[PDB]
Amino acid sequence: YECYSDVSVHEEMIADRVRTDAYRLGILRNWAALRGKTVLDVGAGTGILSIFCAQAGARRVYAVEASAIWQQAREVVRFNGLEDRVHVLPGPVETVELPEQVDAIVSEWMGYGLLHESMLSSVLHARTKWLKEGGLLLPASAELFIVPISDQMLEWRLGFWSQVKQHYGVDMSCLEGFATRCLMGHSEIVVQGLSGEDVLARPQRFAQLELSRAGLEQELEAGVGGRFRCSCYGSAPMHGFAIWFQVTFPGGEKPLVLSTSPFHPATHWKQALLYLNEPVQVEQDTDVSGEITLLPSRDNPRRLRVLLRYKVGDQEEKTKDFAMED
Amino acid sequence: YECYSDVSVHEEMIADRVRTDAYRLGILRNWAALRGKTVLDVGAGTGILSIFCAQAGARRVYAVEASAIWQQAREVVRFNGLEDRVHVLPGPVETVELPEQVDAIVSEWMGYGLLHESMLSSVLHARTKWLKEGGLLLPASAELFIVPISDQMLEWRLGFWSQVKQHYGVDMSCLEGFATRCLMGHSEIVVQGLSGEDVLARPQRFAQLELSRAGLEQELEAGVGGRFRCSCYGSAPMHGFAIWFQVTFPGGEKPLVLSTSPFHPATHWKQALLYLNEPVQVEQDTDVSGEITLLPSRDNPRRLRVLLRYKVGDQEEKTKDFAMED
Ligand SMILES: Nc1ncnc2c1ncn2[C@@H]1O[C@H](CSCC[C@H](N)C(=O)O)[C@@H](O)[C@H]1O
Ligand SMILES: Nc1ncnc2c1ncn2[C@@H]1O[C@H](CSCC[C@H](N)C(=O)O)[C@@H](O)[C@H]1O
């Protein structure tokens, strides 16, 4: 059967060493709590996290996987001789039947912008249904950050048309307006990796999601987020905002943090970019504030929508609402 | 209006210096034939080729463009003060009405694998309808090449699963079979850029398309191509074949060749790859032969289909038919 996408998606995740080592170490550092205990792996994929749990000493791991990759998970487990310790089960976690409640849930559920097409609702469903009172959740929480940015690659693309004269003796500088409207004037969230120098101010946490928190499902439906305020470092053309997340694994010891910040090593999640309609020049101490909400799209409840109200310096407040890139 | 794709596509073409300089110089080297003459630019895009023709001395250029980018073409021409020499006209070349027959047609019509979603039929329609007897076609011809290849990036992806043990202490080598079926076992043409070291034998020309040739439209409908034979250079895991094209501009003087070969500087066309179902080991002097045809797909006449019958060394003849990547 056709499976190009199957392999590519899992290759990308497992090739993401930042992600995979964070889970590797985040699970292993909890060995004392996992040794001789049971684990549910929500969305086991190739089974890698389930085998990490077994390495950490778990007696039984339930590796639940909804798509066809479950077949590969079964094979990886059998091949590593762990079929008596890791039970790969097909189908959605919402309807899986387990022989027992579990001591722990592990899951990599995070989407682009944390919440775009994420498995969070499934993890919470599984927590409610299958996790023992006082059970371990790995990771245990997630936090969302926002900061104003100047995107060097975007700047290059905006400038491209004025470079045509130098290359080919045809003046196309008149197309800057066009490029700006097309590249910035849309209402789509753009997934792109930034570096530290693109960041124009101190990043601000705008949401914290404690996965054990009661009523988190209802919060996610209504929208998560809040206000933010920061001050710019120097002269720059601000292009908009970047948002990203981190998730935290409890330690034995200090917690382990898997971060997708532009200051930290790159991951496959990159960051989620929210472009203004056009650049705005900022200076040292330019105040930038706003209010942001992440919520389900109307027409597709799995698709991320962002509501943003913002103010840059002395410019009037502006609204720009986004929906995730196709 | 939403125009992200508009700008990106044209940015990519104009940013492709190999392509754009080839047209720049290919047109300019024909200055003696263009000076004081008329040109039809089929699919003018941003108008760049039309302005090249004006620089070459054309009295009048008809810049015909079917999509919304015509608006930008109009602006570029007005901005360069050439509205009296370059006439940007909206809509498909098939229904454009010109005041006169033209002395020359210029067009960049080539698709991936030369013929995937190409404008060749439109160029030939325009040639028949609008070009004067003995008129100049730029470029004048196209040639197609095939060679057996070993794709280093594919090899890396095939090997990936056996590297997991080293990174994360989980053995996933058992997934090689899976990766191979998924990455090679499909029937899609893959667009990817190769280097000279991926090429396993002397490339063979398998088709030549003379754009003035009578009945070329009927050839394209029936399928273009032919047999080929070559001999491998050394020990390698052969993954399949790469195909590519060149187009030729007559000189004043020697012709100018725009090539998309893996031995030549990279272009946005890259090459079109035809993977075997699994790798085959070849050695010095391993004979590789076959027959290849490029033709319209059944369900979408603009989509490229490739019929391939091939024989590697002592292995029996095999058929594998492909259709272009979604
Ligand atoms: N409701 C659900 N129940 C079970 N599996 C699900 C699910 N929703 C998504 N999935 C699966 O969850 C996986 C998430 S990707 C993470 C895979 C693996 N745990 C790893 O870390 O490498 C995908 O394979 C997807 O098919
Ligand atoms: N039948 C047709 N008539 C007119 N324009 C067409 C056409 N089919 C495709 N096009 C246009 O032809 C262009 C080809 S891309 C090449 C654009 C430009 N000449 C350059 O070299 O940079 C696209 O803009 C496409 O919209």
From Swiss-Prot, chains A, B:
Automethylation enhances its stability and antiretroviral activity. S-adenosyl-L-methionine binds at residues 10, 19, 43, 65, 94. One of its GO terms (biological process) is chromatin remodeling. Residues 1-325 form the SAM-dependent MTase PRMT-type domain. It is found in: Nucleus. One of its GO terms (molecular function) is histone binding. Keywords: Chromatin regulator, DNA damage, DNA repair, Host-virus interaction, Methylation, Methyltransferase, Nucleus, Phosphoprotein, Repressor, S-adenosyl-L-methionine, Transcription, Transcription regulation, Transferase. InterPro entries: Arg_MeTrfase, Methyltransf_25, PRMT_dom, SAM-dependent_MTases_sf. GO terms for cellular component: nucleolus; nucleoplasm; nucleus. The active site is at residues 108, 117. The keyword DNA damage applies. It catalyses: L-arginyl-[protein] + 2 S-adenosyl-L-methionine = N(omega),N(omega)-dimethyl-L-arginyl-[protein] + 2 S-adenosyl-L-homocysteine + 2 H(+). Highly expressed in kidney and testis. Its EC number is 2.1.1.319. Disulfide bonds: none annotated. CDD domains: AdoMet_MTases. It is an enzyme of class 2 (transferase). Interacts with EPB41L3 and NCOA1. (Microbial infection) Interacts with (and methylates) HIV-1 Tat, Rev and Nucleocapsid protein p7 (NC). Belongs to the class I-like SAM-binding methyltransferase superfamily. Protein arginine N-methyltransferase family. PRMT6 subfamily. Arginine methyltransferase that can catalyze the formation of both omega-N monomethylarginine (MMA) and asymmetrical dimethylarginine (aDMA), with a strong preference for the formation of aDMA. Preferentially methylates arginyl residues present in a glycine and arginine-rich domain and displays preference for monomethylated substrates. Specifically mediates the asymmetric dimethylation of histone H3 'Arg-2' to form H3R2me2a. H3R2me2a represents a specific tag for epigenetic transcriptional repression and is mutually exclusive with methylation on histone H3 'Lys-4' (H3K4me2 and H3K4me3). PANTHER family: PROTEIN ARGININE N-METHYLTRANSFERASE, PROTEIN ARGININE N-METHYLTRANSFERASE 6. This is Protein arginine N-methyltransferase 6. It comes from Homo sapiens (Human).
